[PDB]
Design a protein around this ligand. Structure first.
Ligand SMILES: C[C@H](CCC(=O)NCCC[N+](C)(C)C[C@H](O)CS(=O)(=O)O)[C@H]1CC[C@H]2[C@@H]3[C@H](O)C[C@@H]4C[C@H](O)CC[C@]4(C)[C@H]3C[C@H](O)[C@]12C
Ligand SMILES: [Mg+2]
Lengths: 552, 66, 1316
RNA sequence: GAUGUGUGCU
DNA sequence: TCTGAATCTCTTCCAGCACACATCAGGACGC
DNA sequence: GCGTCCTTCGGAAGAGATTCAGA
């Protein structure tokens, strides 16, 4: 390629062919002049090594270099390896009619809808705009339509809404680990420069909203659009291929909203009153005449399909809350009521969606999933389930547990220094006792944080399941587990080095009270372990899936 | 193993595209092999309907036509 | 006492412990290293002098002429840093050395000399570092990152485990030189010690022993002790050492002096050795069968015939005993070979030894180094002399020699560069000693074995390589030159030195582009410690242990700051108080602790001397006397921590802040965040963009002032004084009379930097922060820079956040931002970017910059002038024309798609030979007028100051004040005054004014030459027009937003003012975050920062309220004193009594925006103090308040957290990342779309992407993504025509990339083809 | 077009 | 002294996408 | 400014070539 100026590109193959032709011509000239046998033998050696370097460079003892002392590539380095033609330009290619932008939430969408920026769709669906502009006669030739599009006239914006109507696109993330990495959505043209994504598929995508880029793709031909509509559509991809569990699981806001709604405590604005259905429960809660955690006896009409596809009616009077009564309004006709009459966590609603799919089908399941989305977001916004520094409560007995563990490890000191156990055995027992102490502190804190609440039912004090915010977002399973919250209050535990070995000394402090200047240095080991484990040992796990997809 | 069984696949293009391209291509050139383009990666490289999903009916028609 | 820059907005501090050592100059490593590299230093100690005396003098191959070095000197730079940045040329200085050539008289190799000729010859041209720690190499600014490489010396690696598949630990000894060849010793599974130099192949070390001219006698005597067998009547009595019999089994009946000591089969316990020492016996009996397991030391020859009986190092049997007994060899010497104490590795290596003598060993070495070449004795001897015994091909540095000697427990620390025989022998002894079991290996992650090669030494190495190349060139030239006519420039070629230096500073792994988008990023980029580059390891062949943190990193390297990705742990960052040793090692300050009193003398302890002592910990309470209030203080003894006593300690940490780097120290409440979310927090604080109106952070740390004054963007006042004239482009100080010089004092002028392009297209802008007639002290800020505020690093804005879910618009990590945020114009950031339109005189004719473009109407040419350049100040929109360039048959530069802006600066560079256009001469005239006006103004200012000093002098010694005005200001020098020293001073000032006029005229003439000169460019371009746009990037949904605690996120919606939740006072909330980002990622410190910011803004709101209705100073002072004394035992101790009732009104005005709170890294606030500060206002103690829904208008049925968290804005803007691609450009070697965003390229449906389509079975769409849409040529156009014809149908051909594969396979000997 | 450095998400 | 088992030695592999910047292309020697 | 030319440093595993031993 002629670069900027008089120089040329330093293409490897050209230099190798130049060297080979040099050796061949010089050898031919020497053979024509009847050179001494040692000279022509040496030149034959030079020709052989030049041809060797041209065919497969680096297989000999030394790989030749042209500039910067860098081993140049031959005819084999571009056929073999990670940068060869097979893996770089054959099994995967750069693709036109594509785009890429940072994604935002826009939770007003549905499972069959995505959000494209208004400017990306004009560059993506440009030939479609050209075709319809030529069809309607608003333009005359291709270049006139090109100029009209580049000038972004008002008519082009009107006709864009026509091509973009029911033409599904391929939303795609950069690491496509599994089958659900590419899902097809219909586009909804919006302003801005961000690709809005429906949060119900963000768990499947593993696409957090912390600055990641997704890639769009436009099915051009008819069959591609029909495949995206019938196969790769996100509506028909609500069951992961890994197992029978659903993959559209609400998470991290909807679970919290549902769990805070479908819960009961013994007091309210109105508690013992009776209602004739979900509608009056909604009327009570909107007006504020009854709390969302009341314990009332509404009259509901749940359906059953004991017949061969016919729903038989029944009406009962069950003792439920106001929140569960409100939630029953969106449940499709046909599921038993004994699915929301509890504290709906994440696994609970996952099982609920699974049984909805198993009983009713696909369309009620997707409609109900969207309704769960809406009624989780609304009552999570109204909840105000915040987090303060007064929510992580330190148990008053963790230091007794660390004292007992310190006494036992001091006993272990005398155990190994005398000779009863050795250094490796001491290391195996010290981790044992530290893990036992960590497991005791975690359980003690969890009990103290889940049961320590006092409330009166209009009389003496009674105990209920706690309303601490951290407990809500650790029990609902929206985002959290025992590990993170356990490290937020009580014992952080013992961390591991990148090689997999565990530190002999667990740091004894929690993030709610603080860390020393030395316990932080010790936790640095685990913090670096996690990152240098991800970035440097996901390679030998992507290799596994590569050579697994290869073999099957 | 999966690597050993993948490197000894009958269609030499798959093994050549996967790993040890020199050691597989040399073996295929020596043996004078003839690929049938039966699997999925072979048709991906060639650029046809892979005999996997919607193109499976077309591949059946093309196979039974001969 | 506090200065005026501090008594303007004093930050409340929560530090418990006091600091006795202030933070040093942060970027003090680069300027110190380069100073050591460039300073004129005698005795050949540092810098260019050392390299010159290590290379020069030179004499030819008995050419009788010597070219000896004298001295070097640097001239002034041709262009200053601003001109170098504008043009694109290096900010360097010519290197002039006054070399001399001397040749002796014939028949006198050491006698008299013939002639000497000397001149300052110009060779090379080396870059200079600016006053802010960076170079200017090609207009862009580079920073040379220091390298953390393995220290030269001897290293005893282990290679434990995974070798030999049996767990047999080997032992390999490495001698890494500073410059030379490696000398790897190692063992073998068969317990043989094999040497291996330069990783060629193994061979026994006895070969190099004989290469050192050591006979097998000498080796066996050296490595082993002796046991004597004496001929007597019979039975061959044994000379016995009592200690030699420690811990083995008696193969026979041990006895001495007749009596039996140890019975047969019984082990020799320590009591037996002790009792044998007590008896004092040495001669014992032994059966002759025990001699079978013995080896003879030296060779034995017969005393009768002179024939060798048994040579050196062979076993002894009964026949050999019989032969030696009859011969008469009375003294028999044998090797003391044990199994665990002294193994016979040397004997085994001699058994496997192929060579026998020095000559054969040298020939074998020559064969190993250069295989296949016919060797002679002289060539082998010269090669082995050159490898390890020559200073011209092998040189351990002084630090290498020091490490070498201290690793072998020697007393001497100095020595020669090359090794010696005793050095190699000692290395062998130490390796064998480690093999036996005494001692242990040394890990290569202990930081006392890893140096820091800074900029100066890296430049030294490259300059030395260039000097070696020139050395070879002049050595070749001086042997074939005609003497008496060669000036000392004809042999010295200036090309190689300059070429090597430019190659290093411009194209290398460690000449990094400066990450300069805000002061923190650049000041921590200069303070980087990269383990990569030449002489170091690579990310691929990097073990997982090197990434891990060593216990010796404490105080020298930040444990919690390293970039994510492939290079993690290899790009370690320097700590705050860490320094560099004279040997290049890392060492950290410590306070020396006496018997019971903590002294204030600071000692810097290296990474090795730390383990010998026991060091106390910074968070240890002291009581006014250097005494520990506790009898048991926590400490660390040897890379591990345990409880200690107050009597055993001898060192204590300077401060808690010394552990973390400068970047990671700016995070408040860092001791509550997990280090996992502290690493990312530090990185995203490094990547912040400066906002429009910079705003101080409320919950600070107190180090922000140090970073702001150190990074160099702030115009720190050199000399204190009074601001005589402030302006948006300059600041003038009338300095105090105490600090004025006798002569040339005058005054000083600070020229500020206006809106100019930065290295990351952000906006650097120095703006004044001082007023007229304001007394400024020494070393205080004068000009607010980018993302600073009154000398305080302000990387973002303080935003009123609320942790609550809001309709899922903050679902996963998103951030919901009010319309009021952009209404207040807070996060809109300036983005200066340049566009260059070169005019290449390519083939078919040169191209013009004319103002008329064919086939384009006047709509796009309205902004253009009649010359071809766009007007300065035009509000250009995307797609418009900036400069009209047309090639001989339309290639004019245009603004890129979807970017607005305003042209603010156009610079035109033309060839010397292409005359001008009218716009170029307009710019030239503007530049001349501006330069003349600037020089005239600055000289007018300094001469006003000079005559002010004159008038101040004249007031003593016969003054008449009235006649000064009526007498013209020209002859103010000879006025009424006697001939005392004041008249001499007046004459000196007259002389300096004359010199000022002379430098005015000469520098104006020089500036005229510098602007009017040609300014040559690259070969093949006529003229260059650079257009500098100015983009104002507003805030919009899609760009990253992140706090200091690593809580990142993307804006999802901009709600109006009314929709966001508001408290009972109606104040809207700016940001509605997500609560669940607190627990799962353990950054709890953000909640505490939110609470402290809420308290700070409450105090600020109370101050604002008390200032709104004007109350007397008493109430404001009382409230502010209550606020500043609220801390339990803080060392702030500020008293408002010393404030003079005027400088406290300014303080109260500056606090109405919110009281700034400091929070040391590991000495931060406690929640009791936070709640007390909350109670000081009228805020709830819980930290949570009550907000009502913005839309619904009803109560939120839970109290929620509301506060002011310092919310940064990252420069990962969405419009810098938004991209789409229709049909467009295509690659050349393969017919595929291009890759990237600058090129109009599409995304990559990679190898992993195709499996996600085969998995669904969607075959047709896959076939479009790799056959008809990208790859093929005919179908690519056919499908486009079908799409714009109404017919959606695809007709696949063959991918062109498969034909490329077929052709590249057929290029080999392989025949691939397609059948029928 | 290729190398070198830095960076984002996994 | 032939022939399996153990060891030595040579080769292959190491995630995906994206963005920004830089250099670089024979550079040495004769004209 | 033109113009033509002759360093080492990973490590986990598999395979193919040697050495050993051993009966
Ligand atoms: C005598 C002086 C200490 C004074 C007591 C010794 C101790 C360590 C030596 C330096 C180090 O080797 C690093 C470096 C090696 C490069 O080659 C360039 C020179 C450098 C600076 C050396 C010059 C000098 O020799 C030093 C300072
Ligand atoms: Mg992510």
């Amino acid at each position: 390629v002629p670069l900027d100026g008089g120089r040329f590109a330093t293409s490897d193959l050209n230099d190798l062919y130049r060297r080979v032709i040099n050796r061949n011509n010089r050898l031919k000239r020497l053979l024509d002049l009847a050179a001494p046998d040692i000279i022509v033998r040496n030149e034959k050696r030079m020709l052989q090594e030049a041809v060797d370097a041209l065919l497969d460079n680096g297989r000999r003892g030394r790989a030749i270099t042209g500039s910067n002392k860098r081993p140049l590539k031959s005819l084999a380095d571009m056929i073999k390896g990670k940068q060869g033609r097979f893996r770089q330009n054959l099994l995967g290619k750069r693709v036109d009619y594509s785009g890429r932008s940072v994604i935002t939430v826009g939770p007003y969408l549905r499972l069959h809808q995505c959000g494209l920026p208004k400017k990306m769709a004009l560059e993506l669906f440009k030939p479609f705009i050209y075709g319809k502009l030529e069809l309607r006669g608003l333009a005359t030739t291709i270049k006139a339509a090109k100029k009209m599009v580049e000038r972004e006239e008002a008519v082009v914006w009107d006709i864009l809404d026509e091509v973009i109507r029911e033409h599904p696109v391929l939303l795609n993330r950069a690491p496509t680990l599994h089958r659900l990495g590419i899902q097809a959505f219909e586009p909804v043209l919006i302003e801005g420069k961000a690709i809005q994504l429906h949060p119900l598929v963000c768990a499947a995508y593993n696409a957090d909203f912390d600055g990641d880029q997704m890639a769009v793709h436009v099915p051009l031909t008819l069959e591609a659009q029909l495949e995206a509509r019938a196969l790769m559509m996100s509506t028909n991809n609500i069951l992961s291929p890994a197992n029978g569990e659903p993959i559209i699981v609400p998470s991290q806001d909807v679970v919290l909203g549902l769990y805070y709604m479908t819960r009961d405590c013994v007091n309210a604005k109105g508690e013992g009153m009776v209602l004739t259905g979900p509608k009056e429960a909604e009327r009570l809660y909107r007006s504020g005449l009854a709390s969302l955690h009341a314990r009332v006896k509404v009259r509901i009409t749940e359906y059953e399909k004991d017949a061969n596809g016919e729903l038989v009616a029944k009406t009962s009077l069950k003792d439920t809350t106001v929140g569960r009564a409100i939630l029953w309004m969106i449940v499709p006709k046909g599921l038993p009521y004994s699915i929301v009459n509890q504290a709906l966590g994440k696994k609970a609603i996952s099982k609920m969606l699974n049984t909805c799919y198993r009983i009713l089908g696909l369309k009620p399941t997707v409609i109900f999933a969207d309704q769960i989305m809406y009624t989780g977001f609304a009552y999570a916004a109204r909840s105000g389930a915040s987090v303060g520094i007064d929510d992580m409560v330190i148990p008053e007995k963790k230091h007794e547990i660390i004292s007992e563990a310190e006494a036992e490890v001091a006993e272990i000191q005398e155990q190994f220094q005398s000779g009863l156990v050795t250094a490796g055995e001491r290391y195996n027992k010290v981790i044992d006792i530290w893990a036992a102490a960590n497991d005791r502190v975690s359980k003690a804190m969890m009990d103290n944080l889940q049961t320590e609440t006092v409330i009166n039912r209009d009389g003496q004090e009674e105990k209920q399941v706690s309303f601490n915010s951290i407990y809500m977002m650790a029990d609902s399973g929206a985002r959290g587990s025992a590990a993170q919250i356990r490290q937020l209050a009580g014992m952080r535990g013992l961390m591991a080095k990148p090689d997999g070995s565990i530190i002999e000394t667990p740091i004894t402090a929690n993030f709610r009270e603080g860390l020393n200047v030395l316990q932080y240095f010790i936790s640095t080991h685990g913090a670096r372990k996690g990152l240098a484990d991800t970035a440097l040992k996901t390679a030998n796990s992507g290799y596994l899936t590569r050579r697994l997809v290869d073999v099957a | 193993g999966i690597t050993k069984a993948s490197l000894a696949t009958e269609s030499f293009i798959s093994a050549a595209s996967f790993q040890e391209t020199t050691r597989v291509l040399t073996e295929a050139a020596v043996a004078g092999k003839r690929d049938e383009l039966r699997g999925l990666k072979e048709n991906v490289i060639v650029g046809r309907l892979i005999p996997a999903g919607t193109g499976y009916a077309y591949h059946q028609d093309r196979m039974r036509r001969r | 006492v506090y200065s005026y820059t501090e008594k303007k907005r004093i930050r409340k501090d929560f530090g418990k412990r006091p600091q006795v050592l202030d933070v040093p100059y942060l970027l003090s490593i680069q300027l110190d290293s380069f100073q050591k590299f460039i300073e004129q230093d005698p005795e050949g100690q540092y810098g260019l002098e050392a390299a010159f005396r290590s290379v020069f003098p030179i004499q030819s191959y008995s050419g009788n002429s010597e070219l000896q070095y004298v001295s070097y000197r640097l001239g002034e730079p041709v262009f200053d840093v601003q001109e170098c940045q504008i043009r694109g040329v290096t900010y360097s200085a010519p290197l002039r050395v006054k070399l001399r050539l001397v040749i002796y008289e014939r028949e006198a190799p050491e006698g008299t000399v013939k002639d000497i000729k000397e001149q300052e010859v110009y060779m090379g041209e080396i870059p200079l570092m600016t006053d802010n720690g960076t170079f200017v190499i090609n207009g862009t600014e580079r920073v040379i990152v220091s390298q953390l490489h393995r220290s030269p010396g001897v290293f005893f690696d282990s290679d434990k485990g995974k070798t030999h598949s049996s767990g047999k630990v080997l032992y390999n000894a490495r001698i890494i030189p500073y410059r030379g060849s490696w000398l790897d010793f190692e063992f073998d599974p068969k317990d043989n010690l094999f040497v291996r130099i330069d990783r060629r192949r193994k061979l026994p070390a006895t070969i190099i022993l004989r290469a050192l001219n050591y006979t097998t006698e000498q080796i066996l005597d050296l490595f082993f002790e002796k046991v004597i067998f004496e001929i007597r009547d019979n039975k061959l009595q044994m000379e016995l050492v009592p200690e030699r019999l420690r811990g083995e089994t008696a193969s026979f009946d041990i006895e001495a002096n007749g009596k039996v000591y140890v019975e047969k089969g019984r082990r020799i316990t320590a009591r037996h050795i002790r009792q044998l020492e007590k008896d004092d016996v040495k001669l014992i009996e032994v059966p002759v069968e025990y001699i079978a397991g013995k080896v003879v030391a030296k060779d034995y020859i017969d005393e009768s015939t002179g024939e060798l009986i048994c040579a050196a190092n062979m076993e002894l049997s009964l026949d050999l005993l019989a032969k030696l007994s009859q011969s008469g060899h009375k003294r028999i010497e044998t090797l003391f070979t044990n199994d665990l104490d002294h193994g016979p590795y040397i004997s085994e290596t001699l058994r496997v030894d192929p060579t026998n003598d020095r000559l054969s060993a040298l020939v074998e070495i020559y064969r190993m180094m250069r295989p296949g070449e016919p060797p002679t004795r002289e060539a082998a001897e010269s090669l082995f002399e050159n490898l390890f015994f020559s200073e011209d091909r092998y040189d351990l540095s002084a630090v290498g020699r020091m490490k070498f000697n201290r690793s072998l427990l020697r007393e001497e620390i100095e020595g020669s560069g090359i090794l010696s025989k005793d050095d190699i022998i000692d290395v062998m002894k130490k390796l064998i000693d480690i093999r036996n079991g005494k001692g242990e290996v040394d890990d290569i992650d202990h930081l006392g074995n890893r140096r820091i090669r800074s900029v100066g030494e890296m430049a030294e190495n490259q300059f030395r390589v260039g000097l070696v190349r020139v050395e070879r060139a002049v050595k070749e030239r001086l042997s074939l030159g005609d003497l008496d006519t060669l000036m000392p420039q004809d042999m010295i070629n200036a090309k190689p030195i300059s070429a090597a230096v430019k190659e290093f500073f411009g194209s290398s792994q460690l000449s990094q582009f400066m990450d300069q988008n805000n002061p923190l990023s650049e000041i921590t980029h200069k303070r980087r410690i990269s383990a990569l580059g030449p002489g170091g390891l690579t990310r691929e062949r990097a073990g997982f242990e090197v990434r891990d943190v060593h216990p010796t990193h404490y105080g020298r390297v930040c444990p919690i700051e390293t970039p994510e990705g492939p290079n993690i742990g290899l790009i370690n960052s320097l700590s705050v108080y860490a320094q560099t040793n004279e040997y290049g090692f890392l060492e950290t300050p410590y306070r020396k602790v006496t018997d019971g009193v903590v002294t204030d003398e600071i000692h810097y302890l290296s990474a090795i001397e730390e383990g010998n002592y026991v060091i106390a910990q910074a968070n240890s309470n002291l009581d006014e006397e250097g005494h520990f209030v506790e009898d048991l203080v926590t400490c660390r003894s040897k890379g591990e921590s345990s409880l200690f006593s107050r009597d055993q300690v001898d060192y204590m940490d300077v401060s808690t802040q010394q552990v973390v780097s400068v970047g990671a120290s700016l995070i408040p409440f860092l001791e509550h965040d997990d280090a996992n979310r502290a690493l990312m927090g530090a990185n995203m604080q490094r990547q912040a963009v400066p906002t429009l109106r910079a705003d101080k952070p409320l919950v600070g740390t107190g180090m922000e002032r140090a970073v702001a004054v150190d990074s160099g963007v702030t115009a720190v006042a050199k000399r204190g004084g009074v601001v005589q004239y402030v302006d948006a482009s300059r600041i003038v100080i009338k300095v105090n009379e105490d600090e004025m010089y006798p002569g040339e004092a005058g005054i000083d002028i600070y020229n500020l930097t206006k809106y100019t392009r930065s290295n990351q297209n952000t906006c650097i802008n120095q703006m004044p922060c001082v007023s007229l007639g304001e007394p400024v002290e020494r070393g205080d800020v004068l000009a607010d820079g980018p993302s600073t505020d009154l000398g305080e690093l302000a990387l973002g804005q303080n935003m009123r956040v609320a942790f609550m879910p809001w309709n899922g618009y903050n679902f996963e990590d998103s951030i919901l931002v009010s319309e009021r945020v952009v209404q207040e114009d807070r996060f809109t950031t300036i983005h200066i970017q340049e566009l260059a339109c070169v005019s290449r005189d390519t083939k078919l004719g040169p191209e013009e910059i004319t103002a008329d473009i064919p086939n384009v109407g006047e709509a796009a040419l309205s902004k253009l002038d009649e010359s071809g350049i766009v007007y300065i100040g035009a509000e250009v929109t995307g797609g418009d024309i900036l400069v009209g360039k047309v090639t001989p048959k339309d290639s004019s530069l245009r603004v890129p798609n979807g970017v607005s802006g305003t042209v603010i600066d156009v610079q035109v560079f033309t060839r010397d030979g292409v005359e001008k256009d009218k716009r170029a001469l307009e710019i030239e005239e503007m530049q001349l007028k501006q330069a003349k006006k600037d020089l005239s103004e600055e000289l007018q200012i300094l001469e006003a100051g000079l005559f002010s000093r004159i008038r101040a002098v004249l007031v003593a010694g016969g003054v008449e004040a009235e006649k000064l005005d009526k007498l013209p200001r020209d002859r103010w020098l000879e006025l009424g005054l006697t001939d005392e020293e004041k008249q001499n001073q007046l004459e000196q000032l007259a002389e300096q004014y004359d010199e000022l006029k002379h430098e005015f005229e000469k520098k104006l003439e020089a500036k005229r030459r510098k602007i009017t000169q040609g300014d040559d460019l690259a070969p093949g371009v006529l003229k260059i027009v650079k257009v500098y746009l100015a983009v104002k990037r507003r805030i919009q949904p899609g760009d990253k937003m992140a706090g200091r605690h690593g809580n990142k996120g993307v804006i999802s919606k901009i709600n109006p003012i009314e929709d966001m939740p508001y408290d009972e006072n109606g104040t809207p909330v700016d940001i509605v975050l997500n609560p669940l980002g607190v627990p799962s990622r353990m950054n709890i410190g953000q909640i505490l920062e939110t609470h402290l910011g809420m308290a700070a803004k409450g105090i600020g709101d109370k101050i604002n309220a008390m200032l709104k209705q004007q109350q007397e100073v008493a109430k404001l002072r009382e409230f502010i004193q209550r606020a500043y004394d609220l801390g339990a035992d803080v060392r702030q101790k500020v008293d408002l009594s010393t404030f003079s009732d005027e400088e406290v009104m300014r303080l109260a005005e500056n606090l109405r925006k919110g009281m700034p709170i400091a929070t040391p890294v590991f000495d931060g606030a406690k929640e009791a103090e936070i709640k007390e500060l909350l109670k000081l206002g009228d805020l709830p103690t819980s930290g949570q308040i009550r907000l009502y829904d913005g839309r619904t208008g009803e109560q939120f049925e839970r109290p929620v957290t509301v506060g002011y968290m310092y919310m940064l804005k990252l420069n990962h803007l969405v419009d810098d990342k938004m991209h789409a691609r229709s049909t467009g450009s295509y690659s050349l070697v393969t017919q595929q779309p291009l890759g990237g965003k600058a090129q109009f390229g599409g995304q990559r449906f990679g190898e992993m992407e195709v499996w996600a389509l085969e998995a669904y079975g969607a075959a047709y769409t896959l076939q479009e993504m790799l056959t008809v849409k990208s790859d093929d040529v005919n179908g690519r156009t056919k499908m486009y025509k079908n799409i714009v014809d109404g017919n959606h149908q695809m007709e696949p051909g063959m991918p062109e990339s498969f034909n490329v594969l077929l052709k590249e396979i057929r290029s080999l000997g392989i025949n691939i083809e397609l059948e029928d």
